[PDB]
Design a protein around this ligand. Structure first.
Ligand SMILES: CCC1(CC[Se]C#N)C(=O)NC(=O)NC1=O
Ligand SMILES: CCCCCCCCCCCC
Ligand SMILES: [Cl-]
Ligand SMILES: [Cl-]
Ligand SMILES: [Cl-]
Ligand SMILES: [Cl-]
Ligand SMILES: [Cl-]
Ligand code: NA
Ligand code: NA
Ligand code: NA
Ligand code: NA
Lengths: 311, 311, 311, 311, 311
């Protein structure tokens, strides 16, 4: 219950590995994800060394309480991980092979600027604090790093689960702290977003555009203002249920542009009727005819400008 | 305590069984279900064998801490199960009869493509990790796999609770792992979905179709656009309260088709009026008369095409 | 720390009592209810019998760890109850009088077919598993069963808290198990249901019926379709916040019937106008006049048919 | 680990005091409030009396396990309080001075009949169960009962925190139980309820009243029915997010009355038009002119009747 | 397991420091924030002093159970913090250097009067209660007060994390209590507020203003009342999801003013039509022409008055 002594003035190397068993509950609002995995740890504690001849065993098993185990913590976790030690195996040279199953709700920022065509890199930061008698440094054993094939996140494609092999060693509260970065790369499954969100939202806008093939101000006011109600009602229906993104998103710019188009279409309908009343039906009919091409063309062009700006 | 020694070079067989006491909280959004059940374990440990004559007992009881018990874990759980050891009984031959009551929130994918006429197979994966001293293999005693008659999930018919007898034995982090798949087959209770969701949604669409028996553009604009608002408002009312399904569902296709029909009906109403105002009432009246049959026929046929594609 | 020995071959009778301190959080969506109560247990253990003369005490008090206590569990709970042992008293004959205060979230199905005039019977199932050396059977001490007068559930009248005195004894995992049924009968007290949900919903329907005293198709389309929107919007306002009931409810049938009446009223308004435009105002006016009586009469009769079917 | 012996046949007096550190999460729907506070207990145990000369200490400190401490519980809590013993000090006469910090979710009924001008008295009931060898009675020293100045509940004015000095001593399951009543008096901050809820709700009603200064049935139908939609939509916006109150509230009566006024205004608009079309414009214009005064006067009077009935 | 003895009659100084690791879950509705941090404590205990020559070590490490550690608690926490002792180091002079990693959901009031241009000061109040044999006072080690550079709150700019070096010493429950205030200053990221909430809300108001360039009462009623519906529907879309603020906010005043403008615009539309129908088109046209300037000017001025009043 004290760290192993150094042979010379070298730090203790704790080789790590994370193997994803299950990944679940990716919360976009909270920017958190719950993960269930193995955490394999390996280090040399020469005090535990033995002769397999005298012992009559080629490997010894210990209880966590019986031996020194490094305090590995996660940097970006809500509460400490719920861990269960699966196995502890000591070889005759004193090499400890530790294995545990943990479940953790990890906090990792998400960038929704390119939503719903966005990709994310989920982080899991391992950390070890160095002690009084010696310094502890983390390492990655790539043979011990991977993910179960059945690992899934509904609406996401799990690209890869890797680790940045080089640790970040730094001083914190007068002690060395070695930090490791485990990355889970995911890309969104945006298929049903076209028929369920985009297409019906465009149909409602297109219905407002039929006021350019009508001279009735009463029918035109009912067209543009009722489609604005239908649009707002449709936005409540497809609402993300997360608090509004403080920054401007791709989908957010399109929806803002759609609100601008309902305002510009009201301005046209109001101008058309005012010119018709103010004995100028030549200008009223020429504006309404221009709008039939101007509205879809300006819309198509502005969407290409946004798509270019965001991608 | 170490694992029991093999008589020959055979692995240790741990006979399992799960008996569902209560099933609750089936979350469609989270794809998780909370279960409370018994987990029975049986294996032979010859070290624990005794003579009932010398001992004066026909069965011995032990505390979990006193004897070797295999570490059985569940693969698809959020956090480790909340377990309470109910009984441990050792017979003179060394047979250990273990029993525990546990509660766990199990993660099981759900396929909503055929919703609300869908059936689901909920999984509970048992797993045991082998040690270096000896290999551990799981077995299913099907007489031990069951469920309480009073077990229920509102809106579902619990068909069966089974296990696939053959375990999935595989290597993971240089050790053998025996995995058992327990299945809970459930089928949805879609009764009230016709009168509460389908019938009122179709009525709103049918009201938009009365514009084919009217020449008033003002009454037709109020018909088709107000029914679109009534439809969107009705969708908000019958909203699933789960984030949108990343894949296209049966119900999702129908609702997309309904949005298309409101757009096509606006196009007709706009064409009818434009042909009437552009001195062509022969073409305007012939289109409106055709729509009276074309709309219900194309709808009925497209539904048959979707029903055929999904089932 | 062994069960008491039988005098003859009789099972151990554990007399139970439950005294409701507080009842709260009745969740209709989850079909669960939280309860805070006393659980009294009484059984005879002749090993604990004493002479009050030699001991100098008429009653002995023990710590739970000092004596044998039967493991009583609840069948229909989410997780095990939060229990705290209040008192353990042993009389000179060996009668143990155990008392504990517990809190538990009990799962009990709810039938909403007669909502909001429904009554429910909430269950709490006690169970004891028999042990190696002897069988354990539950009994009810009616003097120890009851509820605090201040116990309440907002929107419900707590009729009674009783128990089914005869236990359900059966075999489970090769051991006898004795089960007790504790019933809490509650009836809904929703006075405000009529003025807050029914009356405004009927007013919206009655407003659609004013189209029978109007010949204006434009005013009639605005009447029936805007009231349909107002109805749907009112249903969103009075939405139960629980996922839709898989079976058809009383309130559910009325609301379905109301949606049918909005569709039938559109059919009338469409027929009236088509007969008027197709040079038949004799038939148009006779239908509109008939509807003034037919609609309220068919509605009143259909409601009596539903009320008769559900009650 | 036995109660202190009486000098004469007197019960043990346990002096209590609750000091509110933080008050949070007042849930109107659940009728529960989460409180964090100190619980001070004082009682005399002559067995713990000592001579400060021989001991060489003026005060002795003990661990809770070392001495007898009365089992104090709260009656109206969800689960037992989360407690942490802060200090235990024994003076030479045997006086025990116990202090603990606890958090607890207290269940206390709320009366919303006068909402949002309502005041509430939140209760906390301390209770002690008497034992075999002696009776235990609670006492309160109001000098010890208080609250932190920074204690807050958003939207409420915490008037006072007190205790009813006289305990309720009663028999429960053949033992005496002494109960104390702590009371937290709070009154609502209804400031923004006039400009955010009442004022916009009245404006929507007043817009429906402009139909009394119009003869156009088409404009009157659009006025009265669209304001009914705007009212229902506004009620969804200002919805309390708690299930509807089973009893009739003040705000509930006003809103019911507002729904009645939209129905009566439709009846007027329908009568006006029917009298006009049935060659009686003398009666139609006289009703519409009467309504201009009748509607605001009947509204103003009915509100005074409700305000008088509720306050 | 006794506090250290004073050299003279001085109180024990416990030097504190908090180092923010992660900040998450800032709940505006609950006025709580979850934080993960280090808590460093330093105090002198001469009983633990040693000669480094005879002992032969830099610092002596202890288990929390082995030495006296001051009970530091947080004032404004829901439940006690989840703490993990990271390290305890004693230097030759008797200086104890304690370190722990904790997670806590801190309660801190939020002032939304200037929302969404508001800044908040989040508090974490440390407190120590003085003991029998000596008084304990808190201090701040400015070298140990800090925050990780990667600390974030989505939609907020974390300005600073400082501590009020001077503690608040006061009597509580007959004992001295030293309290420290740790402040986390945050300012909101209101960027997407303008295009996502302000601009579409103003467009809906501007559409109602087109009724000043129209004489049609039917088109004007449809303009002002349908935009009121669109506004209310847009408010439901951008609803804060927190229960209503009891005090009047900046955004709250603007939205109240917008509801007043819809009522005043209805009054104009009603007056215009009544003057027109009552043979006075000179006054009707002069009011409608005045409103074209009066409405945007009064709006712009009233907004400047509110902006001045709130900032
Ligand atoms: C309420 C329906 C509405 C106003 C906007 Se739709 C909604 N909500 C209306 O009242 N009058 C119309 O002529 N058309 C409409 O669609
Ligand atoms: C014009 C009718 C608009 C209907 C508004 C419905 C508001 C839905 C609120 C849903 C909360 C999840
Ligand atoms: Cl951790
Ligand atoms: Cl598990
Ligand atoms: Cl239980
Ligand atoms: Cl308690
Ligand atoms: Cl704390
Ligand atoms: Na064991
Ligand atoms: Na026991
Ligand atoms: Na004690
Ligand atoms: Na200690």
């Amino acid at each position: 219950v004290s760290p192993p002594p150094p042979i010379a003035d070298e730090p203790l190397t704790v080789n790590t590995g994370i193997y994803l068993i299950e990944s679940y509950s990716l919360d976009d609002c909270a920017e958190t994800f719950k993960v269930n995995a193995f955490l394999s740890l390996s280090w040399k504690d020469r005090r535990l060394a033995f002769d397999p001849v005298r012992s009559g065993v080629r490997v010894k098993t210990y209880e966590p309480e019986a031996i020194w185990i490094p305090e590995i913590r996660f940097v970006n976790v809500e509460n400490a991980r719920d861990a269960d030690v699966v196995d502890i195996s000591v070889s005759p040279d004193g090499t400890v092979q530790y294995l545990e199953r943990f479940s953790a709700r990890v906090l990792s920022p998400l960038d929704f600027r390119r939503y719903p065509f966005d990709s994310q890199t989920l982080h899991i930061y391992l950390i070890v604090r160095s002690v009084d008698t010696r310094n502890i440094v983390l390492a990655v054993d790539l043979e011990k790093v991977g993910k179960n094939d059945d690992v899934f996140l509904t609406g996401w494609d799990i690209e890869s689960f890797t680790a940045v092999v080089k640790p970040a060693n730094f001083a914190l509260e007068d002690r060395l702290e070695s930090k490791l970065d485990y990355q889970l790369r995911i890309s969104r499954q945006y298929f049903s977003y076209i028929p369920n969100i985009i297409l019906p939202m465009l149909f409602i806008l297109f219905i407002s555009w039929t006021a350019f093939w009508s001279t009735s101000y009463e029918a035109n006011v009912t067209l543009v203002v009722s489609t604005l109600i239908a649009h707002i009602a449709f936005n409540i229906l497809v609402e993300t249920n997360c608090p509004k993104t403080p920054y401007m998103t791709y989908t957010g710019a399109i929806i803002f542009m759609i609100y601008l188009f309902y305002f510009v279409a009201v301005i046209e309908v109001t101008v058309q009727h005012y010119l018709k009343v103010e004995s100028q039906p030549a200008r009223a009919a020429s504006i309404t005819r221009a709008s039939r091409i101007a509205f879809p063309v300006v819309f198509l062009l502005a969407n290409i400008i946004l798509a270019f700006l965001f991608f």
